[PDB]
Amino acid sequence: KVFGRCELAAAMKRHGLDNYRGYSLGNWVCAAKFESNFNTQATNRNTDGSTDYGILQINSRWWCNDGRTPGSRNLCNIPCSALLSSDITASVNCAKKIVSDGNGMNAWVAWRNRCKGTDVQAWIRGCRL
Ligand SMILES: [Au+3]
Ligand SMILES: [Au+]
Ligand SMILES: [Cl-]
Ligand SMILES: [Cl-]
Numbered sequence: 001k002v003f004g005r006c007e008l009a010a011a012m013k014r015h016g017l018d019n020y021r022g023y024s025l026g027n028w029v030c031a032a033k034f035e036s037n038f039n040t041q042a043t044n045r046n047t048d049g050s051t052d053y054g055i056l057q058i059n060s061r062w063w064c065n066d067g068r069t070p071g072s073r074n075l076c077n078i079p080c081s082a083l084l085s086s087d088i089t090a091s092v093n094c095a096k097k098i099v100s101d102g103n104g105m106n107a108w109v110a111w112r113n114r115c116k117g118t119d120v121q122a123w124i125r126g127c128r129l
Helices: 005-014 025-036 080-084 089-099 109-114 120-124
Strands: 043-045 051-053
Touching: 005 025, 005 120, 025 109, 025 120, 051 080, 080 089
Parallel strands: none
Antiparallel strands: 043 051
8 A cells, every 4th residue: 555645644643653752753754755655565675685564664684574584583573464564553563662672763774864853744744633
């Protein structure tokens, strides 16, 4: 599924991502935009053989099991495939663990490089909420 901006914002809010660990909803929408362009089915292989999955490009090295990332963990306790669902519940639950791990949203390199410090409220500008 390819979400629209406000549609994604609303879903993230429903699953309690709004101001989770102090990160406003716009930060999460901005990260989703540059991580996956709002496409739940997005996958990308990393140089190290891990793969990133879904709307927030969660990495098989640490957070999900895809069965082809030797030495990797599965800290969200889920198959990576679940992170590609039209329903974002699994990706949000896992994102909550990731942003809590110590470095906040810097865990998402595209958030650091393209969202941190910017006017992220623009991402939720106009959304009925
Ligand atoms: Au923080
Ligand atoms: Au949802
Ligand atoms: Cl939920
Ligand atoms: Cl959803």
